[PDB]
Amino acid sequence: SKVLVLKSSILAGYSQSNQLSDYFVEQWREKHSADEITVRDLAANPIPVLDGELVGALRPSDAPLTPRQQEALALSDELIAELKAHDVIVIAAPMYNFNISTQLKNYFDLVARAGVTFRYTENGPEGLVTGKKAIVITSRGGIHKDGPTDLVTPYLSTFLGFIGITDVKFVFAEGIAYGPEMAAKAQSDAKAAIDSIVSA
Amino acid sequence: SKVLVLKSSILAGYSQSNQLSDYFVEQWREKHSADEITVRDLAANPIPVLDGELVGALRPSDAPLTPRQQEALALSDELIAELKAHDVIVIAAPMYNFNISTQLKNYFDLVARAGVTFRYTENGPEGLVTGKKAIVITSRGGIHKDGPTDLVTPYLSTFLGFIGITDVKFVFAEGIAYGPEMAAKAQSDAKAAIDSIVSA
Numbered sequence: 001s002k003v004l005v006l007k008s009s010i011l012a013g014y015s016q017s018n019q020l021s022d023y024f025v026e027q028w029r030e031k032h033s034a035d036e037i038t039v040r041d042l043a044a045n046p047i048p049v050l051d052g053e054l055v056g057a058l059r060p061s062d063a064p065l066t067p068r069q070q071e072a073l074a075l076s077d078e079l080i081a082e083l084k085a086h087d088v089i090v091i092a093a094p095m096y097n098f099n100i101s102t103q104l105k106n107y108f109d110l111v112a113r114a115g116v117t118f119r120y121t122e123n124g125p126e127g128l129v130t131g132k133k134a135i136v137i138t139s140r141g142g143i144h145k146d147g148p149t150d151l152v153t154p155y156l157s158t159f160l161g162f163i164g165i166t167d168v169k170f171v172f173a174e175g176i177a178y179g180p181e182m183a184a185k186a187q188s189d190a191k192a193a194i195d196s197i198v199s200a
Numbered sequence: 201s202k203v204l205v206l207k208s209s210i211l212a213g214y215s216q217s218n219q220l221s222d223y224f225v226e227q228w229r230e231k232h233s234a235d236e237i238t239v240r241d242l243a244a245n246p247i248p249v250l251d252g253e254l255v256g257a258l259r260p261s262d263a264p265l266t267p268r269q270q271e272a273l274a275l276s277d278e279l280i281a282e283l284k285a286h287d288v289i290v291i292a293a294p295m296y297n298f299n300i301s302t303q304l305k306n307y308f309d310l311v312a313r314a315g316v317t318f319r320y321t322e323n324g325p326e327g328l329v330t331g332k333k334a335i336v337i338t339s340r341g342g343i344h345k346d347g348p349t350d351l352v353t354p355y356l357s358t359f360l361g362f363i364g365i366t367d368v369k370f371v372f373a374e375g376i377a378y379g380p381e382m383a384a385k386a387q388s389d390a391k392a393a394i395d396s397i398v399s400a
């Protein structure tokens with residue numbers, strides 16, 4: 001198949017989720033070497049903030065668009081085509097201030113578009129990005145998993161399910177802020193979880 | 201007292217949460233006319249995205265800061281001083297793509313700072329923005345309240361509680377996307393909720 005890797009950390013080479021994404025990539029190339037892999041780093045190639053002007057680019061219109069709107073529309077179309085073009089979608093979602101990173105959020109805000117990645121319907125909202133497996137690699141400083149301060153995990157499930165990606169496996173790298181021994185254990189635990197997704 | 205109003209809609213004068221924030225303001229001036237009121241529109245006066253460079257401004261250091269870091273630090277300090285300087289904090293939090301707006305998020309990402317608005321401690325993390333009443337005015341297109349697709353409400357409670365704002369009252373303006381009759385009912389329901397916060 002084709003694997004999409006989205007990175008969203010603001011910590012570059014020091015990023016725990018990026019080191020895990022990279023590992024994922026190495027393991028996929030090893031086991032499934034026909035497959036092509038695309039990596040988009042939403043920190044190194046930043047998506048603009050959704051503001052009052054750019055939101056108009058995302059609505060179906062025959063009104064003229066400002067230069068920024070045109071650019072934001074073309075960038076929207078490129079992100080969505082890329083997303084639809086891949087089978088396995090890997091999303092690094094570090095938690096910052098109990099949310100995902102703004103770098104990832106801006107990608108979602110350009111990707112969620114009525115009549116393109118979802119559509120309204122007699123029988124509720126329906127997702128149009130179909131037939132995908134998503135793996136979410138989520139790194140955190142503290143320990144949040146299965147608890148009430150983990151809003152990141154239910155939100156990703158909600159947003160991805162919305163646009164049609166309902167097959168999502170979460171990999172967790174938690175306790176990073178406790179120091180290098182805990183960071184190393186997180187990496188080792190998370191790497192075993194990846195190993196079994198890849199070898200399934 | 202002193203009332204802080206934060207607006208975060210990208211829809212300007214057409215914004216439901218901004219029309220409610222405005223109403224809040226009129227009612228507070230009416231009942232408590234000694235009080236001063238500050239309004240910061242985080243869409244009209246945008247906070248920058250937290251990236252790899254700006255995050256360094258928010259860590260206590262004696263390393264030289266780049267021009268952007270300096271600017272982001274001064275802007276951080278101005279936002280936090282303002283927040284600490286007010287008694288009642290009103291936050292318009294429209295839901296976009298199951299999250300708050302990026303405009304609000306960027307404010308939070310500059311406001312959440314170790315040793316300034318929170319501090320670590322034997323007995324867990326502890327909030328340093330203390331003694332505040334928060335009112336959150338949250339507008340949505342659909343109907344989410346008390347259900348599993350409402351991640352916005354638990355996240356605001358979590359983030360605000362984290363920095364010490366644990367007294368939070370939510371006002372809801374839902375079903376906006378069903379049209380002007382539902383939008384008008386939402387406004388009327390939300391306005392009664394505000395009336396009883398103000399008159400308490």
Ligand SMILES: Cc1cc2nc3c(=O)[nH]c(=O)nc-3n(C[C@H](O)[C@H](O)[C@H](O)COP(=O)(O)O)c2cc1C
Binds near residue numbers: 010011096099143144
């Ligand atoms: C701006 C910022 C905010 C953070 N907020 C949280 C937080 O809400 N909860 C948490 O458990 N860790 C928090 N952390 C720690 C990160 O989740 C941890 O460093 C994680 O490894 C980040 O993923 P990454 O290294 O891929 O960037 C924060 C780190 C930064 C830089």
Ligand SMILES: Cc1cc2nc3c(=O)[nH]c(=O)nc-3n(C[C@H](O)[C@H](O)[C@H](O)COP(=O)(O)O)c2cc1C
Binds near residue numbers: 214215299
């Ligand atoms: C970019 C965008 C995304 C939206 N996503 C949601 C959504 O996730 N759920 C929802 O119920 N309504 C959604 N809406 C509808 C808004 O929540 C509704 O229009 C609300 O009134 C916005 O608050 P405001 O008018 O103050 O901007 C969205 C609107 C926009 C423009």
